[PDB]
Design a binder for this molecule. Structure first.
Ligand SMILES: [Mg+2]
Ligand SMILES: [Mg+2]
Ligand SMILES: [Mg+2]
Ligand SMILES: [Mg+2]
Ligand SMILES: [Mg+2]
Ligand SMILES: [Mg+2]
Ligand SMILES: [Mg+2]
Ligand SMILES: [Mg+2]
Ligand SMILES: [Mg+2]
Ligand SMILES: [Mg+2]
Ligand SMILES: [Mg+2]
Ligand SMILES: [Mg+2]
Ligand SMILES: [Mg+2]
Ligand SMILES: [Mg+2]
Ligand SMILES: [Mg+2]
Ligand SMILES: [Mg+2]
Ligand SMILES: [Zn+2]
Lengths: 156, 211, 224
RNA sequence: GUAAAGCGCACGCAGGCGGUUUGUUAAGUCAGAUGUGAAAUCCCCGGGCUCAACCUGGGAACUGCAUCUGAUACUGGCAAG
RNA sequence: CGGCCCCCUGGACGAAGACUGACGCUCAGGUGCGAAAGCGUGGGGAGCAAACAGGAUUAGAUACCCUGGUAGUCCACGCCGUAAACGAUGUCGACUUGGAGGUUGUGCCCUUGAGGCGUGGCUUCCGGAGCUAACGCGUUAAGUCGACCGCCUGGGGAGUAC
RNA sequence: AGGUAACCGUAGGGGAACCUGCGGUUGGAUCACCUCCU
């Protein structure tokens, strides 16, 4: 019942005594469509292996975000490795308006309505390195209430 | 870096011969000449019957040849009428009353001959060699093998240069004499030329000599 | 364990004042003869509260990994694990013992195959030199994975002696979320131990005290 | 810091910014009112051309400006520390 | 900025107090200082040494080597105002785990002695969080923050033309 | 003793490549290609 999506595949070199030896790095995310998602990235000698192993690491690392109703709970940004990502909840039925790399991440997590935008460099691994962190840093209307020792309406 | 025929060295150890009759020198050359000719005739005939192994053994008053294939009914046709006519044509090409018999194969994707020839056939189909040999090794190891190696050489995909490649998977111990290594070779005649294919399957170790 | 029970064993003993770690200041009674003295007033309640958690884990069918690689205390930790039907690491810790679980399972399978093969037979079929070589490999695997051949899966709790010496194990555990129970001398960094016991980790007497008390409470947790 | 980008260093006028308490002021600031901010346009709710474009009612809005009356925490002014 | 001595003179720091009562920070223009080379005037001139004079060597040597040797190098007084003038890091303030030092103070205790506990200033090296593209930085931040100034906008063309 | 280059400011020579003088800085080597989507 999971959900997966490849993001990008690059052919990386490695120069040896005689010439080089190419390889293949896959990058993918896996989510449950219910605010719980992880990502993976793994090299290999050829594509299906990389796409396979990277797919598996992502089955671990699956953090659980406290989104509400296919949308976030408050605007949020996340900066990692020179990539900046702004996101914010959107109205109902707005959709997933996001650059390529993020769109999958948002999709598999369970998000339905969200605005987004990247900044700086747009290296895909960096922005997901920069997105999931941003996601988990959301705060439920009770995570605060708990950590602020109040009732929900006492903040709302 | 040339290897040595993995079948040959394991003869007597774990690999029985493909011809078990005995004879003296006087009648030796012609003997293998005859059984060679019957091998060649057969391999021309049953090309569609997935034939893998063909052994000639000659008792003093008769000859008898045995066939390991994966398409038994094909060879038998109906009432062995094709089998019977093969028996006739071999009895005359061997000039000795023959008696042929077949012993089919159960794991057609697990012997080197059938897999190599299937590979080379698909190569004539101009399917992509890479995915082909990959399916080969996958089916093999999936079926319960312990090692598979395939190697294809010469003018790949019609390339104007000979890009010889290979693939390995599982475990194929080539220096361990006691190892059961099935091994075979076949060939494809492309428009662009001829391409060689070698195949190894390792079904594990056997302990206690040929017995 | 009572403060008097520890003190006679020497639990209060510590490393030199020259060699200590910054986070250990709360747990340090003071110094004498340039020697760090550990405070039993903190040691006893923390050990008791850790024993509570260990009893809980073992009383929900927990698998316990006793960890210590000291050449003096290896057999003590092994016997400690045997006294409570648990699993242990008494030889040098191998990186990825927990994180690289799949490889350990393949090595476990080879150890199981070798012992089964010797009982089944075919050693006579092997050349005498080959059969002896197989026996040597079986002995080496038994020396290495003797404790974890029957662990089956990743353990539910870890007990560590001299957490600084075994730092790779605790890093792995934290990466897996497996809880760490560890005897922490003054020179160790206590961040990786979720239930931290500050105490001597070299002295055979105090180590055996820790192990015996833990094993008694583990058998108690099992008995229900 | 090394990708372009810290003046060679210092002093210093103009300028910018300013610890802490009270009082005062009401300038900034905030609140309210009032005037004004053409119509069209844009937007909402309508209506009319068979639909639509288009045309049209009403509204919203025009974030502004001015004036008056308040508010005194904040920043400023004044006084006293 | 390096012999020693005197004379004239600036700053820093510590100790304890007493006084002043926000007198502050920053700073466009502005002003001054500003390595070496250079210029002017006069002096000086051992050593060294661009240029130059030769020797050699070299395809040739216009260079490298030798022998020389002027300006210069020094002094006074002007002038020039540039350097990878660099920590390639503007100035001031507050805050944020540690270890090893160096250096200069100063309190107490060792009876003091040799020494043990304090508490400053400056400085060096590790390294935590954190930060960084990375390298790294890391209480002397390139951390967390304020205030003010200077500066940047693809590379050459060009710090050149006017 | 380890040992050896670059570059800055400037002056002279030099046809220019550049070489010398004075001081300053470490920023104390040099390069790089045949195969390719699950
Ligand atoms: Mg040979
Ligand atoms: Mg500069
Ligand atoms: Mg100043
Ligand atoms: Mg003012
Ligand atoms: Mg003020
Ligand atoms: Mg209008
Ligand atoms: Mg209508
Ligand atoms: Mg005021
Ligand atoms: Mg000069
Ligand atoms: Mg002069
Ligand atoms: Mg000269
Ligand atoms: Mg300059
Ligand atoms: Mg300098
Ligand atoms: Mg500077
Ligand atoms: Mg100019
Ligand atoms: Mg010259
Ligand atoms: Zn210890």
């Amino acid at each position: 019942e999971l959900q997966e999506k490849l993001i990008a595949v690059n052919r990386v070199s490695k120069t040896v005594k005689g010439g080089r030896i190419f390889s293949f790095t896959a990058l993918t995310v896996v989510g449950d469509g219910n605010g719980r998602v992880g990502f993976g990235y793994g090299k290999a000698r050829e594509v299906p292996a990389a796409i396979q192993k990277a797919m598996e690491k992502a089955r671990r690392n699956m953090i659980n975000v406290a989104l509400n109703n296919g949308t976030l709970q408050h605007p949020v940004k996340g900066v990692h490795t020179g990539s900046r990502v702004f996101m914010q909840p959107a109205s109902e039925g707005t959709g997933i308006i996001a650059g390529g790399a993020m769109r999958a991440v948002l999709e598999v997590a369970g998000v339905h309505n969200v605005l987004a935008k990247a900044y700086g460099s747009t290296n895909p691994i960096n922005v997901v390195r920069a997105t999931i962190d941003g996601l988990e840093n959301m705060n439920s209307p009770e995570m605060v209430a708990a950590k602020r020792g109040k009732s929900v309406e006492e903040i709302l | 870096g040339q290897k040595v025929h993995p079948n040959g060295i394991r003869l007597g150890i774990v690999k029985p011969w493909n011809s078990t009759w005995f004879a003296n020198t006087k009648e030796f050359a012609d003997n293998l000449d005859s059984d060679f000719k019957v091998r060649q005739y057969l391999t021309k005939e049953l090309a569609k019957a997935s034939v893998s192994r063909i052994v000639i053994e000659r008792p003093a008053k008769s000859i008898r040849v045995t066939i390991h294939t994966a398409r038994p009914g094909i060879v038998i046709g109906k009432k062995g009428e094709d089998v019977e006519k093969l028996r006739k044509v071999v009895a005359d090409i061997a000039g000795v009353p023959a008696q042929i018999n077949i012993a089919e194969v159960r794991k057609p994707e697990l012997d080197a001959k059938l897999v190599a020839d299937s590979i080379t056939s698909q190569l004539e189909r101009r399917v992509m060699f890479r995915r082909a040999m990959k399916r080969a090794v996958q089916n093999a190891m999936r079926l319960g093998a312990k090692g598979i190696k395939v190697e294809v050489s010469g003018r790949l995909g019609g390339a104007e240069i000979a890009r010889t490649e290979w693939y390995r998977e599982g475990r194929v111990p080539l220096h361990t004499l006691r190892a059961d290594i099935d091994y075979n070779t076949s060939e494809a005649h492309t428009t662009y030329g001829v391409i060689g294919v070698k195949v190894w399957i390792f079904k594990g170790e056997i302990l206690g000599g040929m017995a | 364990v009572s403060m008097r029970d520890m003190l006679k064993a020497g639990v209060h003993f510590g490393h030199q004042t020259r060699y200590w770690n910054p986070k250990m200041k709360p747990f340090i009674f003071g110094a004498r003869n340039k020697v760090h003295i550990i405070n039993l007033e903190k040691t006893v309640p923390m050990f008791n509260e850790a024993l509570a958690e260990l009893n809980k884990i073992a009383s929900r069918k927990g698998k316990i990994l006793f960890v210590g690689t000291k050449r003096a205390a290896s057999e003590a930790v092994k016997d400690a694990a045997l006294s409570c039907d648990q699993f242990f690491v008494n030889h040098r810790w191998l990186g990825g013992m927990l994180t690289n679980w799949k490889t350990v399972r393949q090595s476990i399978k080879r150890l199981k195959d070798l012992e089964t093969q010797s009982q089944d037979g075919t050693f006579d079929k092997l050349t005498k030199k080959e059969a002896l070589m197989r026996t040597r490999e079986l002995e080496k695997l038994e020396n290495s994975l003797g404790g974890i051949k029957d662990m089956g899966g990743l353990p539910d709790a870890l007990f560590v002696i001299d957490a600084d010496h075994e730092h790779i194990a605790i890093k792995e555990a934290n990466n897996l979320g497996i809880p760490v129970f560890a005897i922490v001398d003054t020179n160790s960094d206590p961040d990786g131990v979720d239930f931290v016991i500050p105490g001597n980790d070299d002295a055979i007497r105090a180590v055996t005290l820790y192990l015996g008390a833990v094993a008694a409470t583990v058998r108690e947790g099992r008995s229900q």
